Amino acid sequence: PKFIAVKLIPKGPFRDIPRADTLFGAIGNAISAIHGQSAVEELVDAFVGGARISSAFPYSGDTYYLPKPLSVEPALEGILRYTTAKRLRKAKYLDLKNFELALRLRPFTIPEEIPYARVDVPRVVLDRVTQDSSIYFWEEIRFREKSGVYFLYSGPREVFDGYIAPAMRFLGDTGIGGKSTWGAGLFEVEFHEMKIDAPGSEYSVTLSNALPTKTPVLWRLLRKGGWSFGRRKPRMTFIAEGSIVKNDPGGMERLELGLSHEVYVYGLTFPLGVELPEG
Amino acid sequence: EIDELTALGGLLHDIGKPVQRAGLYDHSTQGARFLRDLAENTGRAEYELLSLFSEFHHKGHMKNDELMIRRIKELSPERFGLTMEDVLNALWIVYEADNLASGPLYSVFNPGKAYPWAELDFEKELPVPGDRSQDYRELVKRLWEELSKAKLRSDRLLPVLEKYLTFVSSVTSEGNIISLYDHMRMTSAIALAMLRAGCTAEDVRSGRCRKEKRFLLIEGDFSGIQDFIYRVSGKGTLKYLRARSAYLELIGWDVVLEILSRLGLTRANVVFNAGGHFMIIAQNTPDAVKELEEIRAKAVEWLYREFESDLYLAIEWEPVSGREFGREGGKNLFAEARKRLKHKLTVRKLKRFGEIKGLFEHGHTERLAECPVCGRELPEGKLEPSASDPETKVCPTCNRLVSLGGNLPKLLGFGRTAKNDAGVLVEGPFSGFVPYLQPVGEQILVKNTLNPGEIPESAQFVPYFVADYFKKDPKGGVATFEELSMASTGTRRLGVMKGDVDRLGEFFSSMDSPSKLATASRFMDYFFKGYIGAIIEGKFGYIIGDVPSLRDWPEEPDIVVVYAGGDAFFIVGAWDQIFELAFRVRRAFNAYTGGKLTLSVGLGYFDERTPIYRMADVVSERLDTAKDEGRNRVFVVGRSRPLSYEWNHYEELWRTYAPRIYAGNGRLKGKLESKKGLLWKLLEIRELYVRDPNDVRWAYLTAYLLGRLVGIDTKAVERKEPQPVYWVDGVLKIVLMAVRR
Amino acid sequence: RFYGKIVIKGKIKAVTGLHIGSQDNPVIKDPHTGLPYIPGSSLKGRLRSLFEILVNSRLGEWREKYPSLANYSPGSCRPDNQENCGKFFNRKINRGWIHVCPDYETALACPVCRLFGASGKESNFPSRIIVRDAFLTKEWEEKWRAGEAITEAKIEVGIDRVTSQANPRTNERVVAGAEFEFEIIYNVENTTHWRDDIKNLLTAMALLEDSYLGGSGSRGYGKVKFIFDSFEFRPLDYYRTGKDEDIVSIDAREKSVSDILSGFDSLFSEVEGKL
RNA sequence: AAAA
Numbered sequence A: 001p002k003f004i005a006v007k008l009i010p011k012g013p014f015r016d017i018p019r020a021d022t023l024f025g026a027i028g029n030a031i032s033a034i035h036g037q038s039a040v041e042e043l044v045d046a047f048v049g050g051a052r053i054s055s056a057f058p059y060s061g062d063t064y065y066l067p068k069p070l071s072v073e074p075a076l077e078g079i080l081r082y083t084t085a086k087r088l089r090k091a092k093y094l095d096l097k098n099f100e101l102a103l104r105l106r107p108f109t110i111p112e113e114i115p116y117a118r119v120d121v122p123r124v125v126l127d128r129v130t131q132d133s134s135i136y137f138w139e140e141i142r143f144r145e146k147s148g149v150y151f152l153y154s155g156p157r158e159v160f161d162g163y164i165a166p167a168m169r170f171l172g173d174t175g176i177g178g179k180s181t182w183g184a185g186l187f188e189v190e191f192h193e194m195k196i197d198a199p200g201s202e203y204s205v206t207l208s209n210a211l212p213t214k215t216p217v218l219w220r221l222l223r224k225g226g227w228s229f230g231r232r233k234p235r236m237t238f239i240a241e242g243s244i245v246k247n248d249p250g251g252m253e254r255l256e257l258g259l260s261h262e263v264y265v266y267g268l269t270f271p272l273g274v275e276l277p278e279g
Numbered sequence B: 001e002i003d004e005l006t007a008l009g010g011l012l013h014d015i016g017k018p019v020q021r022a023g024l025y026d027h028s029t030q031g032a033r034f035l036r037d038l039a040e041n042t043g044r045a046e047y048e049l050l051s052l053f054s055e056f057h058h059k060g061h062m063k064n065d066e067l068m069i070r071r072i073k074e075l076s077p078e079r080f081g082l083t084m085e086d087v088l089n090a091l092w093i094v095y096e097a098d099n100l101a102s103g104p105l106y107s108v109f110n111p112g113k114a115y116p117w118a119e120l121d122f123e124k125e126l127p128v129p130g131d132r133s134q135d136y137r138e139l140v141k142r143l144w145e146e147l148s149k150a151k152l153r154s155d156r157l158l159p160v161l162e163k164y165l166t167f168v169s170s171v172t173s174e175g176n177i178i179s180l181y182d183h184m185r186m187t188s189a190i191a192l193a194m195l196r197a198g199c200t201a202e203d204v205r206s207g208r209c210r211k212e213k214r215f216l217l218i219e220g221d222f223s224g225i226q227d228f229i230y231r232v233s234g235k236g237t238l239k240y241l242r243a244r245s246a247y248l249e250l251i252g253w254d255v256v257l258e259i260l261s262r263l264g265l266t267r268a269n270v271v272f273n274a275g276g277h278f279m280i281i282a283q284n285t286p287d288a289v290k291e292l293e294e295i296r297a298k299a300v301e302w303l304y305r306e307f308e309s310d311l312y313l314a315i316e317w318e319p320v321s322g323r324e325f326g327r328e329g330g331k332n333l334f335a336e337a338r339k340r341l342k343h344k345l346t347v348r349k350l351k352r353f354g355e356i357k358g359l360f361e362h363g364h365t366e367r368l369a370e371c372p373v374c375g376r377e378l379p380e381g382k383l384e385p386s387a388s389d390p391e392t393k394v395c396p397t398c399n400r401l402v403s404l405g406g407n408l409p410k411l412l413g414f415g416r417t418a419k420n421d422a423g424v425l426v427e428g429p430f431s432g433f434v435p436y437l438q439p440v441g442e443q444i445l446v447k448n449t450l451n452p453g454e455i456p457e458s459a460q461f462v463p464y465f466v467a468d469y470f471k472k473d474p475k476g477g478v479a480t481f482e483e484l485s486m487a488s489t490g491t492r493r494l495g496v497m498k499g500d501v502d503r504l505g506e507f508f509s510s511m512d513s514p515s516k517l518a519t520a521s522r523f524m525d526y527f528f529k530g531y532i533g534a535i536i537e538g539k540f541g542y543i544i545g546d547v548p549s550l551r552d553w554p555e556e557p558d559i560v561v562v563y564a565g566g567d568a569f570f571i572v573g574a575w576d577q578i579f580e581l582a583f584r585v586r587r588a589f590n591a592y593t594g595g596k597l598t599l600s601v602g603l604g605y606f607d608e609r610t611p612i613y614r615m616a617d618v619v620s621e622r623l624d625t626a627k628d629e630g631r632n633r634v635f636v637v638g639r640s641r642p643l644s645y646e647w648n649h650y651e652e653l654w655r656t657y658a659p660r661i662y663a664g665n666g667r668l669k670g671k672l673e674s675k676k677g678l679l680w681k682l683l684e685i686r687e688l689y690v691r692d693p694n695d696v697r698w699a700y701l702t703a704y705l706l707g708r709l710v711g712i713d714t715k716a717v718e719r720k721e722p723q724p725v726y727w728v729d730g731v732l733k734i735v736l737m738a739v740r741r
Numbered sequence C: 001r002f003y004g005k006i007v008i009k010g011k012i013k014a015v016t017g018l019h020i021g022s023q024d025n026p027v028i029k030d031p032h033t034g035l036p037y038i039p040g041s042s043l044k045g046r047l048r049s050l051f052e053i054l055v056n057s058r059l060g061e062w063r064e065k066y067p068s069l070a071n072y073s074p075g076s077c078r079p080d081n082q083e084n085c086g087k088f089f090n091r092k093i094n095r096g097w098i099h100v101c102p103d104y105e106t107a108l109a110c111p112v113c114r115l116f117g118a119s120g121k122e123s124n125f126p127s128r129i130i131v132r133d134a135f136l137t138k139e140w141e142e143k144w145r146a147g148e149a150i151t152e153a154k155i156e157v158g159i160d161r162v163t164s165q166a167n168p169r170t171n172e173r174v175v176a177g178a179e180f181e182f183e184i185i186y187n188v189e190n191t192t193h194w195r196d197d198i199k200n201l202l203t204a205m206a207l208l209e210d211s212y213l214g215g216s217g218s219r220g221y222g223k224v225k226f227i228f229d230s231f232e233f234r235p236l237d238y239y240r241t242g243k244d245e246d247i248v249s250i251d252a253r254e255k256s257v258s259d260i261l262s263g264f265d266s267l268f269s270e271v272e273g274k275l
Numbered sequence D: 001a002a003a004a
């Protein structure tokens, strides 16, 4: 487990911490604008055969968070306080050092700070003759000073070097989702390496939205849809991140949607090894 | 029938205890004279056979197996069709039921304090724990009248016995905190579970039902309620939310009643149904586990098909034996068999819809859409136009709840019927519900009362309680957020209080029998179901007394209870009558408990026309904020810091800082009028403290501004706790919001 | 298609106090630090409103350059409450009336919605500028760390016309003289439209020099002032290879009136040689 | 999610 880590140093507020389903859609729309139609299909074939990306997770100044495995909920008592056991079950994102602890079913600590805030700003709509207003509210993810968001990449390097690294320079100047004409999804991209110490077992947590091909072990269900060139995507049951499959490669699904081209929904897994309890 | 004679015999065998404390007539023969005397007049010989269960329990007369025989020949088993085998078996079964269910009413919270005797009507005399042989005589007289009048059907006696025997202790001993109602309720529950398991008197005498996995705990729990009831956009009235909180209650009671009516059980088996989380006791036969699995697989599919992965019911069961209802050694066996089921609940909540098996497939129908009130997914139509604004399409089960929110005050109950009938408003997973206006079905749920009036003697009575105080509008219905925000002191806002009992699972994991758990769960239930509306009526001021109040408490306050349940509530209303109500409910929960349990409250003051998902996620976040700090707190108002308060801390502040600046009913003191700017600019001097707590400039500026709080103390700087200028935001800011802003 | 992205950078100078508000009236501020900022929507919609009024004046004189302004009469649709009956401000969002075109192929020829974006039904022409959010220049964070006041508190009053009774309120205004740092990213989607789009965007900016930006503007709370640093073209090949191919025009000391005529024949001669 |  040596992964490339893409860091998205934010220039403004995001609309949401991007799922893998809206990272892959953004990459496909970048590739279709800087390369062409016939190079999105080679991207899709590279992700079918090889590579996988994960969801975006928050970072805050050289500490990188990863989602909590669901493998710790059924045997959180055997790890061990009732206040600690409850706060240790509520929490969503573990630190990289703790996350590698909890993959082996060891006692771990939750971070005492979230790297962003869901704030809703009031906006207004004024008619041009009478300046007569109308409020609506708008939610967004407002980050701290050194904090931001990142995701991980496995697979070969010519796919990263020909597809994902140009896609990230394109999407820095047209954002990842949301009101990107208000300067919302925009960022500066920079790449590092991350290494993850992971136990080699039969079970794997998925760091991206799964959409499985068989029933997993422990899961946390997540309906979402999308919007593809104006057309509404039907709601799909992804598995949320941090969920335990065994040997389940996931699967992308092609949609119809009445367009000039097929629309793939990225339903692949991102496996890290995990140690389970007896169930 | 033996299967109802057993439950009635286990329900009327310790009825000889109030007639013996009264001193009318050996504790059992002097309790069987009651049933024997009642059997002749106003009734039949039905009551005559039920004196066997009082003569022959507690090891007083069931010796040698012959004194039963002359008396049971002296009565007629053939007139009721019972066998000499059957009723002689039912005596032993009721005896072991009482055995392995058992082991002034002292309070379950502080066992050092007792209860005065009362009836249970939620309209007078809040049973605060405190510190006569004729009051029992009046109890027995008024019980004799009711036991004369009522039907002998066991859904007709369980409303009677908890009117009267709730605050009566079962065994008169020191520190006994088990009600007599609940002792007899659980004795009957275990008796019918032994009979439906099929065990008999030779297994009773030979010591076989104990130490054999023969009982079955069923426990079920709703997951995802906060995204079911409060994920609602700006379309959707208050009456719509107040119909969401009574549609989830109807789903829950529907599932419980099919488990009872399909497993052949009575309502004595339900240990509790508080909070969307029920627990019942059942038999362990292999032709019952199959029925439970059918109930689970049908309820879960109706939940998936109706509310797509939004609400979920996690039903599990666990085989126990009779020896695990009590205490063996210093090892708690009921609280270990209950942690073996909580793990199955927890690991079943992580397989969130595994019963469906078509859940992860993609084969979608064409041309979906989305309701604007709740975000659903309805294909190419089936959206029905609303009757509020007929231009906007909504899903049909939002129309079914707008039309139910219209019929909230007019409602005496519900009738639970087969799903495709007339009058059916809303559907449960197994039944349709038709409201019971100003008498249809086989099962009539009747709210907030214990007396069946218009109900057929062929229908099942199920009494349920719901805290449903509301300010009524100029019409006869429910107020909206607009009428609530208008009628408040100060400016126009809306005060939305959540807030629940802290660390209660540790409290319920300490009970070492079901008879004790049933009492503790019923009292914690009845505080929020019943004794929270009696507060908002304006009672119990002898116990409540001094509270932070902006105005004299009105005759008819404007507060709408959205939910009030097992430990929590969610209450809206006039945003500066909600403020007095939070501290008033705290001061009454301190008194209802012995002081042993606490509650947190997150508060929010919203503009009246605000979406309800955000209006709920502000208060639900401020409850976690006021809860992870100290678990005895109150989030009084939003505040800035470098956030909540303790209760007694605020009520010690408000004795001091408030009565020197605030006169009453939204008016400041004399000569501090025309000095309103003195109250805001002090919050400027309060805000040089959050900018730097280390700079000491805020002392002489207060001394200057009061010359035109003032001094520091190392009592704060002994451990770096914040200064007294920091504990004045939530005391000045209320008085500013409720005087002319 | 796509041919590159023109990035316009510079500074805003709040010459008079700047007030936006956050629902005794606060100004909007970053929830973590606490400094103010100018939103991207509050800047973009003010630019769009100014250019809407300018276009509504010129629905007779631009019908040959821009078609589909022939489908509109100058006015508004508030009295006759049918949307897109034929007046210019044709769409009603909630209670107010905006000109937003109803289709793609009618908004490709309307100069407002070609640049600022339309919504329609089944169609949705997205925008073509990104008005990036504007934060204080690091000089004005250093002045914020010197303890200096970055906002003020201005007390105003209303006065009875006969008896001269004071009725005061307070507004929280940004200190006059402040500096924010803006960015506007235009997306070159069609190589014909680029000259007219950047000329219309600079026209919309120059109406904002003589108008205001949020808050009580006619009581003296606007007077924004654009101080450009540089433009960049960022071509299609730049996002492919990541070298330095982007033309950097330099206009470090130029105003938006000195930029529309002085540089448009001259500082864009290099960009028209690459299209 | 501290039995909503």
Ligand SMILES: [Zn+2]
Residues within 6 Å of the ligand: B371, B372, B373, B374, B375, B376, B394, B395, B397, B398
């Ligand atoms: Zn709906």
Ligand SMILES: [Zn+2]
Residues within 6 Å of the ligand: C099, C100, C101, C107, C110, C111, C112, C113, C114, C118
């Ligand atoms: Zn247009």
